[PDB]
């Protein structure tokens, strides 16, 4: 029934049912792993972390997953602080001068200086190089996040750390379709950097405002939309000169300088 409720996008109803199942079979690690993922979809971060902790104690073979997603949940708090203009994220790879105005714009937004923040973003965008490439086989002249607070920047979690990766530093990105429920929140990825470095990563798959301001459909990534505030919720969306591609429909992204 919980799977059915989830399919229908009835998150609260699903949560009710699943917690009753766990209460009935408290030693069942499979149910608690389901519950952690559902809690994460709903943005109940501390309760999600609680379930992970219990899973690690019930099944020591799940401990690597537990470490990975416990730190991923920690990163969502860091995410909030970065977009609130209160924290500088880790920057991956070669330094990019135009990242600084992007970050400063977040601070200026926080202080109600939206026009000045807009000016800094316009400058950052102008300075960031248009790098051609392809999404699978489909060419583009440039690519960015539909979120103007990022533009040509990818949010990543690497080794449990929240970071910004300028797309100009990226050679290729590979992802698969989401498979587990937690993949709607953090999509596993392989990244190769232009200067050679390669690493596995998690990609925060929804916009940061989704948990608080989105509806159930948004939290499940079944829509992308912009709030009256001007901020996006729902599934991450990439835009190019030629079209747009939602994250869960991306498989391979290659840049060719």
């Amino acid at each position: 029934i919980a799977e059915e409720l989830l399919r229908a996008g009835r998150l609260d109803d699903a949560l009710k049912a699943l917690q009753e199942q766990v209460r009935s079979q408290p030693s069942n690690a499979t149910l608690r792993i389901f519950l952690f993922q559902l809690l994460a979809v709903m943005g109940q971060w501390a309760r999600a972390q609680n379930q992970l902790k219990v899973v690690g104690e019930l099944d020591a073979s799940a401990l690597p997953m537990v470490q990975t997603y416990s730190t991923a949940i920690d990163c969502e708090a860091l995410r909030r602080e970065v977009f609130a203009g209160r924290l500088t994220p880790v920057i991956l790879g070669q330094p990019a001068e135009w990242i600084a105005p992007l970050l400063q714009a977040l601070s200026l937004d926080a202080e109600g200086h939206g026009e000045a923040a807009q000016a800094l973003r316009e400058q950052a965008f102008d300075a960031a190089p248009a790098v051609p490439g392809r999404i699978g086989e489909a060419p583009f002249a440039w690519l960015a996040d539909a979120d103007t607070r990022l533009g040509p920047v990818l949010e990543v979690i690497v080794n449990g750390r929240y970071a910004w990766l300028p797309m100009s530093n990226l050679r290729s990105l590979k992802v698969e379709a989401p498979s587990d429920l937690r993949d709607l929140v953090w999509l596993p990825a392989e990244l190769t950097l232009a200067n050679g470095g390669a690493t596995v990563a998690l990609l925060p798959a929804r916009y940061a405002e989704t948990v608080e301001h989105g509806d159930d459909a948004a939290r499940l990534g079944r829509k992308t939309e912009w709030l009256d505030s001007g901020l996006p919720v729902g599934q991450r969306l990439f835009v190019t000169d030629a079209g747009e591609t939602a994250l869960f429909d991306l498989r391979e992204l290659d840049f060719e300088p």
């Binding site: 960015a144 103007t148 939602a246």
Partner: peptide
């Protein structure tokens, strides 16, 4: 417009 989504209508996914 470089890096800009021209459309901000709600998207179905």
């Amino acid at each position: 417009q470089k890096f800009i989504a021209r459309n901000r209508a709600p998207r179905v996914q």
